[PDB]
Write a protein that binds this ligand. Structure first.
Ligand SMILES: O=C(O)CNC(=O)C(=O)O
Ligand SMILES: [Mg+2]
Ligand code: NI
Ligand SMILES: [Zn+2]
Length: 331
């Protein structure tokens, strides 16, 4: 078996290898990359997502989210308070302010220490989940707005034709902005490109060990666990690397820099934080190997996780028994 310790793998495709997205994903899996839950892909040196970022300040963040924490430094939840709209130029100036900017630090490890020590004491503002793309339409390779759709993958593998669409989302981050522990909707893949700015640190649990993270989460967030059988779908819980190590949970970490892709694999739990002002683009995707994970994915029926139009069809086709109760949660 390839990559039996489930290490995060880093790939350096040539421009020739960068032509066929599906083929490259299947290659990475042939090398065991999925066992980690996360891989890094460094694009060929000749490739570019777009010519410049010089004109992005006019994008609107309609609903910036203030991420307010509760708990202790290593075990906390976050709630998202909605704020007034602001442009990306306004948000960048806020991120660079004395109140919100990245502190002085020695290197990524010192910064990671400072994040886990101090995150809970601040409420950074995250411009998350903004439909749109920053890839130039002329970028033909690994353009996250031109990928084959999940509905077309389900049709090709299973014959069934369903409604729904599959589009990217932009994320504008600042120091301490945080993504809670989660897998993707319907345990899909994700791909994330860091267009610009400061890094993003990721933590990941191997898919084969995801249930160990779930059992710890039930112990650490026991009222949330009684409220919902899949409360990590709410995307609010944080657990630090120190706490994961104290509880024997297998995990890995890696820092993504501007210009780099990350792929998350089906049922790869991940969490992380931004080092400073940045912009990422991400989208979900499927391969044939996902189908079985989609059939088995947990679902939030408490009603909190409240997810897309397109996920309806996935549930209806892959999980017809759940259909009914999951749509009672979503209506
Ligand atoms: O970048 C972020 O805030 C969150 N992104 C993801 O969880 C992802 O790409 O799967
Ligand atoms: Mg603009
Ligand atoms: Ni994700
Ligand atoms: Zn729920």
């Amino acid at each position: 078996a390839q990559n039996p310790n489930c290490n995060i793998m880093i790939f350096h495709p040539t421009k020739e290898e960068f032509n066929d997205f599906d083929k490259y994903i299947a290659y990475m899996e042939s090398q065991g990359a999925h066992r980690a839950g996360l891989a890094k892909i460094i694009p060929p040196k000749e490739w570019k997502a777009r010519e410049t970022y010089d004109n992005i300040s006019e994008i609107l963040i309609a609903t910036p989210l203030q991420q307010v924490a509760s708990g202790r430094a290593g075990v906390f939840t976050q709630y998202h308070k909605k704020k007034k709209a602001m442009t990306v130029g306004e948000y960048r100036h806020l991120a660079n302010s004395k109140k919100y900017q990245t502190p002085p630090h020695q290197n990524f490890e010192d910064l990671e220490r400072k994040y886990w020590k101090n995150r809970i004491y601040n409420s950074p503002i995250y411009g998350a989940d903004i439909s749109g793309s920053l890839f130039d339409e002329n970028t033909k390779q690994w353009n996250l707005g031109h990928l084959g759709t999940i509905q077309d993958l389900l049709e090709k593998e299973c014959g069934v034709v369903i409604e729904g669409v599959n589009t990217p989302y932009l994320y504008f981050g600042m120091w301490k902005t945080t993504f809670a522990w989660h897998t993707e909707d319907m345990d899909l893949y994700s791909i994330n490109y860091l267009h610009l700015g400061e890094p993003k640190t990721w933590y990941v649990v191997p898919p084969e060990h995801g249930q160990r993270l779930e059992r710890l989460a039930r112990e650490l967030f026991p009222g949330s666990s009684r409220g919902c059988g899949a409360f990590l779908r709410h995307k609010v819980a944080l657990i630090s690397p120190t706490v994961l190590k104290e509880n024997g949970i297998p995990f890995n970490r890696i820092t993504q820099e501007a210009g780099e892709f990350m792929v998350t694999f089906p049922y790869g739990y991940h969490a992380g934080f931004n080092h400073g002002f940045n912009c990422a683009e991400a989208i979900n995707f499927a391969t044939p190997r996902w189908i079985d994970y989609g059939k088995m994915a947990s679902q939030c029926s408490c009603g909190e996780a409240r997810v897309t139009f397109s996920m309806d069809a996935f549930v209806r086709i892959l999980q017809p028994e759940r259909y009914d109760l999951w749509k009672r949660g979503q209506d």
